[PDB]
């Protein structure tokens, strides 16, 4: 035990070989990594028109979860359920002589941007969610303004992937409800009031609000250095 000793090395300017540290801050990230960062930075340093910044202005995850809990009970049919219902229908038309009315009417979340926009134009939308991760914002920019003038409740929601999972896809950019069963008409009405009070009723206030203009970490530090130098006396 006395055979040990205390070496300690000095990490001064020219004293010892510097230890291996976390150089993760100074990584020469690949080209595609660099674009992703500087693209998000550019979209935050610029005056983003109020058409944007109403996106990335979503509801809390507390609200998002309680919508989905209602939504998953109305998730559409799958390939497995279609096949088991198609042959059930085909067997039924012979035995019961029904005009495909033996199969029930689905109560399904109605997805698809072109379908949903037609839903909003016809007023057939009881509730519409919009994604914020649609990389060309052009496809969804008019959606809040479309949902407003037509008077349908809409919420801007986090996750185009979460929308894709809801509709058995990878991405959907919109989800919507048109008709809810008689058992839980109460749940939607209670939930729509919260959404209306959060997005649609503040739409005209969001229409004048610009985002962006935020500067970098070292930019704000210099900005505060202007303030403290000025206020010092």
């Amino acid at each position: 035990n006395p055979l040990t000793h205390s070496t300690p090395k000095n990490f001064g300017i020219g004293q010892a070989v510097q230890p291996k540290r976390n150089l993760s801050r100074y990584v020469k990230w690949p080209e595609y990594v660099r674009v992703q960062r500087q693209k998000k930075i550019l979209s935050i340093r610029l005056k983003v028109p109020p058409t944007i910044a109403q996106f990335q202005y979503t509801l809390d995850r507390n609200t998002a979860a309680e919508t989905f809990k209602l939504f998953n009970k109305y998730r559409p049919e799958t390939a497995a359920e279609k096949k088991e219902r198609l042959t059930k229908e085909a067997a039924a038309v012979a035995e019961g002589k029904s005009k495909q009315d033996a199969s029930p009417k689905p109560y399904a979340v109605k997805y698809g941007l072109n379908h949903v926009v037609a839903l909003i134009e016809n007023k057939k939308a009881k509730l519409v969610l919009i994604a914020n991760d649609v990389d060309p914002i052009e496809l969804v920019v008019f959606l809040p303004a479309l949902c407003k003038k037509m008077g349908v409740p809409y919420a801007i929601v986090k996750g185009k992937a979460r929308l894709g999972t809801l509709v058995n896809q990878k991405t959907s950019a919109v989800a919507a409800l048109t008709e809810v069963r008689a058992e839980d008409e109460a749940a939607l009405a209670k939930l729509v009031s919260t959404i209306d009070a959060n997005f649609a009723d503040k739409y005209d206030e969001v229409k004048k609000h610009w985002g962006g203009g935020i500067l970098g970490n070292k930019a704000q530090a210099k900005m505060d250095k202007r303030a403290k130098n000025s206020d010092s006396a």
Binding site: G12, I13, G14, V17, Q18
Partner: protein, 251 residues
């Protein structure tokens, strides 16, 4: 007329520099981390003659702060530097001949050489044999330092630009007459193909603006505008004055 001799130099076929025997680009070390918050010591292992350069060069071995490796650097040798000598590079390096202090760290009147034009360019000014830079003064607000260049020009640059304390070695080189075309021959064969020089007036008009005539004579004024084009810029280019310089120029 044909393309003239000074026009043909930009193609760089036979007018590229003869660089076989050179010891590398003489540069200060990279301004990395140590040079700007402390100093780093190194040893000059040899001072060697660089072909085509009047000034000697110094080979200096620094240690790598981040890895176990000896990093060699090719400094321009300042007068008095000897093999076996320590030279200290950084902001906290002492004001000694051979040290690589930033310009802002040295007092007024410091004699520096191989000075950076910008911090980190590894040295641009006062690099030829017997040349130096003087520190005229400092401007700490908007951190700067004004210096006197070998040509006499005044220049203000950032105080972080580094330089070697002292004067380049090999000074007094041009004090000896070459005495012989052969000595001028050997001088330029390790530099570039710029020698000998035929006068333009001894050419034909196809070859030079000065060529031709029943006597050897320029014929038109040898002072040429700055806005003249290539093939025309032979003589004294954009000359403010001409003739034997008498008196001073307030230098």
């Amino acid at each position: 007329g044909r393309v003239i001799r000074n026009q043909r130099k930009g193609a760089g076929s036979i007018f590229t520099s003869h660089t076989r025997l050179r010891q590398g680009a003489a540069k200060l070390r990279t301004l990395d981390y140590a040079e700007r918050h402390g100093y780093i010591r190194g040893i000059v292992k040899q001072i060697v003659h660089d072909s085509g350069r009047g000034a000697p060069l110094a080979k200096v071995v620094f240690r790598d702060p981040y890895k176990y490796r000896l990093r060699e650097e090719i400094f321009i040798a300042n007068e008095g530097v000897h093999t076996g000598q320590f030279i200290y590079a950084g902001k906290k390096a002492s004001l000694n001949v051979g040290n690589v202090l930033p310009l802002g760290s040295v007092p007024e009147g410091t004699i520096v050489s191989n000075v950076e034009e910008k911090p980190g360019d590894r040295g641009a000014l006062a690099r030829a044999s017997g040349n130096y830079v003087i520190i005229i003064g400092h401007n700490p607000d908007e951190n700067k330092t004004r210096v006197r260049l070998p040509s006499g020009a005044k220049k203000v640059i950032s105080s972080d630009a580094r330089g070697v304390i002292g004067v380049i070695a090999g000074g007094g080189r041009v004090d000896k007459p070459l005495l012989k075309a052969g000595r001028a021959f050997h001088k330029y064969r390790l530099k570039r193909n710029s020698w000998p020089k035929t006068r333009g007036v001894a050419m034909n008009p196809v070859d030079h603006p000065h060529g031709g005539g029943n006597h050897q004579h320029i014929g038109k004024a040898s002072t040429i505008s700055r806005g003249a084009v290539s093939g025309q810029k032979a003589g004294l280019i954009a000359a403010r004055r001409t003739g034997l310089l008498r008196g001073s120029q307030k230098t």
